[PDB]
Every structure is written in structure tokens, then in C-alpha cells.
Design a protein around this motif. Structure first.
Motif, PDB file in Angstrom:
ATOM      1  N   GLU A  14       2.161  26.764  -1.313  1.00  0.00           N
ATOM      2  CA  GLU A  14       3.420  26.447  -0.659  1.00  0.00           C
ATOM      3  C   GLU A  14       4.151  27.754  -0.408  1.00  0.00           C
ATOM      4  N   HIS A  43      -3.247  16.847   9.152  1.00  0.00           N
ATOM      5  CA  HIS A  43      -2.152  17.781   9.368  1.00  0.00           C
ATOM      6  C   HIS A  43      -0.945  16.933   9.702  1.00  0.00           C
ATOM      7  N   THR A  53       2.538  23.852   3.433  1.00  0.00           N
ATOM      8  CA  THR A  53       2.126  23.281   2.166  1.00  0.00           C
ATOM      9  C   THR A  53       0.677  22.849   2.323  1.00  0.00           C
ATOM     10  N   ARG A  77       8.112  21.781   8.700  1.00  0.00           N
ATOM     11  CA  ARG A  77       7.303  21.782   7.482  1.00  0.00           C
ATOM     12  C   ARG A  77       5.937  21.270   7.906  1.00  0.00           C
ATOM     13  N   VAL A  88      -0.889  20.394  -5.250  1.00  0.00           N
ATOM     14  CA  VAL A  88      -0.470  21.400  -4.286  1.00  0.00           C
ATOM     15  C   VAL A  88      -1.220  22.659  -4.647  1.00  0.00           C
ATOM     16  N   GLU A 112       2.183  20.258   6.588  1.00  0.00           N
ATOM     17  CA  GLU A 112       1.381  19.963   5.420  1.00  0.00           C
ATOM     18  C   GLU A 112      -0.052  19.691   5.846  1.00  0.00           C
ATOM     19  N   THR A 113      -0.986  20.358   5.180  1.00  0.00           N
ATOM     20  CA  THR A 113      -2.402  20.175   5.439  1.00  0.00           C
ATOM     21  C   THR A 113      -2.953  19.551   4.166  1.00  0.00           C
ATOM     22  N   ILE A 114      -3.531  18.365   4.295  1.00  0.00           N
ATOM     23  CA  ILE A 114      -4.085  17.667   3.140  1.00  0.00           C
ATOM     24  C   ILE A 114      -5.593  17.705   3.313  1.00  0.00           C
ATOM     25  N   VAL A 121      -2.327  20.797   0.360  1.00  0.00           N
ATOM     26  CA  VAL A 121      -2.567  19.857  -0.726  1.00  0.00           C
ATOM     27  C   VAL A 121      -4.035  19.429  -0.810  1.00  0.00           C
TER      28      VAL A 121
END
Ligand SMILES: NC(=O)c1ccc[n+]([C@@H]2O[C@H](COP(=O)([O-])OP(=O)(O)OC[C@H]3O[C@@H](n4cnc5c(N)ncnc54)[C@H](O)[C@@H]3O)[C@@H](O)[C@H]2O)c1
Ligand SMILES: NC(=O)c1ccc[n+]([C@@H]2O[C@H](COP(=O)([O-])OP(=O)(O)OC[C@H]3O[C@@H](n4cnc5c(N)ncnc54)[C@H](O)[C@@H]3O)[C@@H](O)[C@H]2O)c1
Lengths: 235, 235
Positions: free
Chosen positions: B151, B195, B183, B129, B148, B131-133, B185
């Protein structure tokens, strides 16, 4: 099944390598008296002329003992008992010989990861803090709360924990030992060992958390071997 | 200063490569009309016979356009616009050609890390998984709380964010695209992009958090280049 290799140390990692790897011929050197399986058991340490790669998975002492000779051969030399390099004298000597060596040295990441990033930005690294959290049981302690059992340099940790400290030494080889701080914590809430590597650099900050279920090290070595001839290389 | 190389794309990464790298000769191909500096500006894309390594740092479209031809040459081919591989047809075609290719392909980790671990245990990976914020500002949004914005699969993300998704595609190449969930965000408390790569496998669980200050990608490429001839290889 291609290459002929020499494996130093037929313990947990060595047997798994012979078990999983595909080699046309395997020379093995290990003081033990176990009955050899699919390997040509050498009695005197040497580097047969048909060996293309030498894999060390024996001990830090072994690294200091055979490295001189190995480096005289035109082979790929994969090392995992990196704690040996916490020894400045040996470290200086090893790389001195290497400059005049027909060999190539590989330091697979072993039990940790993120070394692709670390070796890429090594010159910009300000510090690396590596924390190993272990169940008190593994230390023979009974604790009601997390407790630091050691904090200091890689050299100091390797002396008190002759076992561990390899991962920290590899990181030390990459960024310079003076930039690595090792912390070992015994935590009663932990079922297994965890490694947290925190990197601060002028390029950015990185954190790699490793929770293995050393199976990872065996596969780390196999990948280095596979990469020797592969047409697709990652990391 | 050794090798002669071909660099596709003279943008942010390409200019930095020429600036930092040491090459005896540099061919460069880029539709742009900027005045070339220390490079032999090709007008027609081709792979000069004295090129030992080809570096792509142009675009996913470029990967699809020149890969066929490049693979016909005995060169090291480093690719970073990996989002191109989110295309099943192209992906299938690319590696089909490669089996019959005299070339060698390298996929440096680029903007992320931990790919040493991932490629080592790829077969045992259950899921990854990523996730890039990002700061809402980078998305032109004004938010009071984290939200979000996407996704799904790597293929879907690459379509909606033609820009990003390269890091996820490389991970996809390693473990199989069906095992990667992306995902994205938008978080108002964040100053810059982060990341977080979480890996679940039968060998253990891993988390790599990357907070760059893409300077990392340039150094990732330089390390791959340096490793081509180096006697000391990490990761
Ligand atoms: N880099 C990493 O992340 C990492 C991970 C796991 C293990 N290691 C290291 O790899 C080495 C092997 O690990 P293991 O779990 O397989 O150990 P093990 O004790 O199960 O097996 C090691 C074998 O090496 C042999 N040996 C030791 N010294 C020797 C010497 N000087 N000459 C010839 N043979 C010798 C022993 O007799 C033994 O059979 C250890 O030093 C260990 O600390 C490194
Ligand atoms: N793998 C990673 O982690 C990672 C990280 C950063 C950037 N990238 C990718 O690397 C590529 C280059 O990045 P950048 O920041 O240097 O981009 P940039 O836009 O600043 O420069 C790209 C250059 O490529 C040229 N170009 C585009 N298509 C071309 C084509 N088909 N033929 C010839 N030249 C072409 C452009 O004219 C431009 O000058 C992008 O596709 C980007 O998404 C990947």
C-alpha cells in the motif's frame, strides 16, 4: 481559442460549452428566443464554411433533422443525443451517408464511462446490462422499497423515457442494440441517480458504476474537442 | 492495411499486434534473437522516415531509452509501459521535449478502463485508489485469508513490483501521481486478477471493476490505431 464551431442547442449543455470552452467564433442554432451572448445567432440552420466542428447538444429530433446536411460538410461532428439512433431506419441511413461523407463523427461517453474498454473489445461482447437507479421522487412515486419501473430494449426505453436512454444508445451503437438490456429502478434509499454498466465478454467482465453529483457530459465534450488538437491523448 | 509502423518489442503484445493488425509495412526492434516473421527486423534502433506511427510494447526501460529520439519524428507515439513515468526526472524531461515535438503521444487505457471519464474530469479529481486483487499463488504465498501485500504511491509500487504498476502510472499521468494510492491484495478466494479503480471528484464518484480473463491491452492499442483514421470515434 483556435477553432470556429457551430453549436446546435443553447440549453444547459450548450451555454456551459460557450461558457467554458475557448472558441474564436461560435455559431449557434436554437429555436428559442433567448438573447444571444457570445454567439453568432443563426436564424436559418446551416453550416458556415468556416466551421471546423459541429456540436449537437439539442435533442434526438435535432440529430435526425440536421445530420443529413451536416455530413455533407468536412467537419468533426460530435453527437450526444444518441437515443436518436435507437431508430433502425435513421441509424441505417446515418451511417450509409457517412461512408460517403467528408466528415468525422465523435460519440463522447457523456454521462457514463468505460467506453474506452467497450469500444476496444466490442466484437467479443456477449451482453451489456445497464441499470439506472433513481430516487422515487424523480419519478413522482412514493415507495417503501426498490422497484423496477422498466426492463427491456434500448428502443423500448427511449419511447417510454424520451428523456433518458442516451447512454444506453451509445453503448448500443458500440456493441449492437440487441446486446443491451436496460433496467430502470426507483429506490427510496437513493439520494441521486446511479448508472451501473455491466459488460460480459470473451475477453473479461467489466463493471462501471457512475454516480454523478450533466456536468460530466459537458467535460466529456470539451475533452473530445481538446483531443482534436492535443499532443497528449488519454483513453 | 494502410500505414507503415515501427513496433518496439516483439513479445506477447508485439507478436499479437503483427498477428491481428493490418499494416503495409512493419519495422520491429527487439534485442531478442527470435526469427522475424512478417517484419523488417532492425538491427540498430532508428525511426525510418516512412513510419507514421511508433508503438512501444517493450518495457519501461525502452520508454526511457528511445523516447528522446522518437519525439524528434513526426509520428504518432503510442506508449503502454507507462510505469516509466513514475520517474519524476524522466517524466519532466519527456513532456518538456514534447512541447517542442512534431509528434503526438497516445496513452491507451491498456489493462483497465474508465479513462474516458477520468481524463474528462481530471482537474476535479480528489483522489484515485486502485486496488489489484490477485490469487496468492501468483505471489507464491499460501494464505487462509486476504492479505495486503503493499500500500503506497505509484513510485513505490513500481519499484517493488517492476512488473505491474503500469495502469496506476497512466492514471497518475492523468490526475497527478500524488492523488493515486495503490493497494495490492493477495486473496485466496480469487481465481484471477481483478482491478478496482475508485475515483472521488467534485463532479461525482466512479468505480471501474476490471476482471480480465493481456488481450485487453492489445485491443486497446488496435483501437487507438483504428481511431487514427476512423470516421466513427467512441469514448
Ligand atoms: N449522451 C449523454 O450522456 C447525454 C447527457 C446529457 C444530455 N444529453 C442530451 O443532450 C441534449 C441537450 O441536453 P440539455 O440538458 O442541454 O438540454 P436543454 O433542454 O436544457 O437544452 C436543449 C436545447 O436544445 C434546443 N433544441 C431542441 N431541439 C432543437 C432543434 N431540433 N433544433 C435546434 N435547437 C433545438 C432547445 O430549444 C434547448 O434550448 C438532450 O437531447 C439530452 O437528452 C445526452
Ligand atoms: N499499460 C498496460 O496496461 C500494460 C498491459 C500489459 C503489458 N504492459 C507492458 O507492455 C510491455 C510489453 O509487454 P509484453 O507482455 O508484451 O512483454 P514481453 O516480455 O512478453 O515482451 C517484451 C519484449 O520487449 C523486448 N524489449 C524489452 N526492452 C527492450 C528494449 N529496451 N529495446 C528493445 N526491445 C526490448 C523484450 O526482449 C521482449 O521480447 C511491458 O513493459 C509490460 O509491462 C502494459
Amino acid at each position: 481559442h483556435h477553432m470556429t464551431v457551430l453549436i446546435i442547442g443553447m440549453g444547459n449543455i450548450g451555454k456551459k460549452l460557450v461558457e467554458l470552452g475557448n472558441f474564436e467564433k461560435i455559431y449557434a442554432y436554437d429555436r428559442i428566443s433567448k438573447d444571444i451572448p457570445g454567439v453568432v445567432r443563426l436564424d436559418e440552420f446551416q453550416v458556415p464554411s468556416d466551421v471546423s466542428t459541429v456540436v449537437e447538444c439539442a435533442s434526438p429530433e435535432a440529430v435526425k433533422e440536421y445530420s443529413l446536411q451536416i455530413l455533407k460538410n468536412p467537419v468533426n461532428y460530435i453527437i450526444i443525443s444518441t437515443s436518436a439512433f435507437a431508430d433502425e431506419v435513421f441509424r441505417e441511413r446515418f451511417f450509409s451517408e457517412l461512408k460517403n461523407s467528408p466528415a468525422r463523427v465523435f460519440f463522447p461517453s457523456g454521462a457514463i464511462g468505460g467506453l474506452d474498454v467497450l469500444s476496444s473489445i466490442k466484437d467479443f461482447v456477449k451482453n451489456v446490462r445497464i441499470e439506472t437507479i433513481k430516487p422515487p421522487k424523480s419519478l413522482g412515486l412514493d415507495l417503501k422499497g426498490k422497484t423496477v419501473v422498466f426492463e427491456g430494449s434500448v428502443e423500448e426505453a427511449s419511447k417510454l423515457f424520451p428523456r433518458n436512454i442516451n447512454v444506453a444508445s451509445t453503448i448500443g451503437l458500440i456493441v449492437g442494440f440487441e446486446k443491451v438490456k436496460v433496467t430502470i429502478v426507483a429506490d427510496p434509499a437513493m439520494d441521486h441517480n446511479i448508472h451501473i454498466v455491466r459488460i460480459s465478454s470473451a475477453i473479461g467482465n467489466y463493471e462501471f458504476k457512475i454516480e454523478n453529483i450533466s456536468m460530466l457530459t459537458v467535460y466529456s465534450i470539451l475533452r473530445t474537442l481538446r483531443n482534436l488538437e492535443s499532443k497528449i491523448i488519454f483513453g
